[PDB]
């Protein structure tokens, strides 16, 4: 599948693409305001994620740090990123269908539109001002709005046993963005698309 990744933000982001135990396509790249990076993601990819990273520094080797979404100090991510991260997730070619969502389960850093560019389904968006409204106890000094699990490390926010419900914190994310996962057992906002669709992920879609 082909994913076009587009930075409509007024600031640079470093895009990242990974399935956890490796990169998707090259794994990451800088994106100045208005730039667009097309990647190829292998069919059948299960548990793939794309996100942005903000305020990064990388040396000549591609080693460094990011304030949000750091993936072990690499430009070219192999692993998932450090919360907080608005996540565009994708598991592909699963019994003939592709499944996508946007997730605030690992917090929110950048507003996001994740939409099919081919026919047969709808896109999802999370573009509210989650950073600006963020509860004080969830604010990440680095920038962004952390998830409750990240901050407090409890069975209830992390859904560790499998039995959790909404919390005050999940309902905050859910109010600013109905269409994204706010906690692990949230009513699913997954879109089922045609198998083998192509995608566009747009940072800061409004503008």
In the block, tokens 């109905």 appear at 178
Q: Report the distance separating Cα 92 and Cα 22, nearest Å.
A: 16
In 147-192, which ranges are continuous DSSP H helix? Answer: 148-152, 155-158, 168-176
Q: Report the distance separating Cα 139 and Cα 200, nearest Å.
A: 29
Report whether 133 contacts 176 (CB < 8 A). yes
Report whether 17 contacts 43 (CB < 8 A). no
Cα separations in angstroms, 147 against 61, 121, 135, 157, 204: 32, 29, 10, 8, 20
Report whether 51 contacts 87 (CB < 8 A). yes
Report whether 37 contacts 4 (CB < 8 A). yes
Q: What value does the CA radius of gyration of the chain take, rounded to a whole number of Å?
A: 16
Cα separations in angstroms, 87 against 95, 104, 109, 169: 23, 7, 9, 17
3-state SS track over the chain: CEEEEEECCCCCEEEEEECCCCEEEEEEEEECCCCEEEEECCCCCCCEEEEEEEEEEECCCCEEEEEECCCCCECCCCCCCCCCCCEEEEEEEECCEEEEEEECCCCECCCEEEEECCCCCCCEEECCCHHHHCCHHHECCCCCECCHHHHHCCHHHHCCCCCCCCCHHHHHHHHHCCCCECCCCCCCCCEEEECCCCEEEEECCCC
| Closest to 88 (Cα-Cα) out of 25, 18, 147, 174 | 18
Q: Report the distance separating Cα 11 and Cα 55, nearest Å.
A: 9
Provide the domain limits for residue 6: 1-207
Residue 192 is part of a domain; what is its CATH number?
2.60.110.10
Tell me how many domains the chain contains: 1
**Residue 40: CA count within 13 A, CB half-sphere:** 2
Q: What are phi and psi of 135, to 5 degrees?
A: -55, 140
Burial class (CB in 10 A: 0-12, 13-18, 19+), 121: middle
Q: Report the distance separating Cα 2 and Cα 79, nearest Å.
A: 20
State the CB neighbour count (10 A cutoff) for residue 14. Answer: 25
Tokens (6 digits) for 17: 């693409």
Omega cis (within 30) before 156: no
Tokens (6 digits) for 29: 């790249």
In the chain, which ranges are continuous DSSP H helix? Answer: 130-133, 148-152, 155-158, 168-176
Tokens (6 digits) for 73: 């100090």
Report whether 98 contacts 190 (CB < 8 A). no
Q: Report the distance separating Cα 192 and Cα 116, nearest Å.
A: 11
């Amino acid at each position: 599948a082909t994913f076009e990744i587009v930075n409509r933000c007024s600031y640079t982001v470093w895009a990242a693409a990974s399935k956890g135990d490796a990169a998707l396509d090259a794994g990451g790249r800088q994106l100045n305001s208005g730039e667009s990076w097309t990647i190829n993601v292998e069919p059948g990819t299960n548990g793939g994620k794309i996100w942005a990273r903000t305020d990064c520094y990388f040396d000549d080797s591609g080693s460094g740090i990011c304030k949000t979404g750091d993936c072990g100090g690499l430009l070219r991510c192999k692993r998932f990123g450090r919360p907080p991260t608005t996540l565009a997730e994708f598991s592909l070619n699963q019994y003939g269908k592709d499944y996508i969502d946007i997730s605030n389960i690992k917090g929110f850093n950048v507003p996001m539109n994740f939409s099919p560019t081919t026919r047969g389904c709808r896109g999802v968006r999370c573009a509210a001002d989650i950073v600006g409204q963020c509860p004080a106890k969830l604010k990440a000094p680095g920038g962004g709005c952390n998830d409750a699990c990240t901050v407090f490390q409890t069975s209830e926010y992390c859904c560790t046993t499998g039995k959790c419900g909404p919390t005050e914190y999940s309902r905050f994310f859910k109010r600013l963005c109905p269409d994204a996962f706010s906690y692990v057992l949230d009513k699913p906002t997954t879109v089922t698309c045609p198998g083998s669709s192509n995608y566009r992920v747009t940072f800061c879609p409004t503008a």
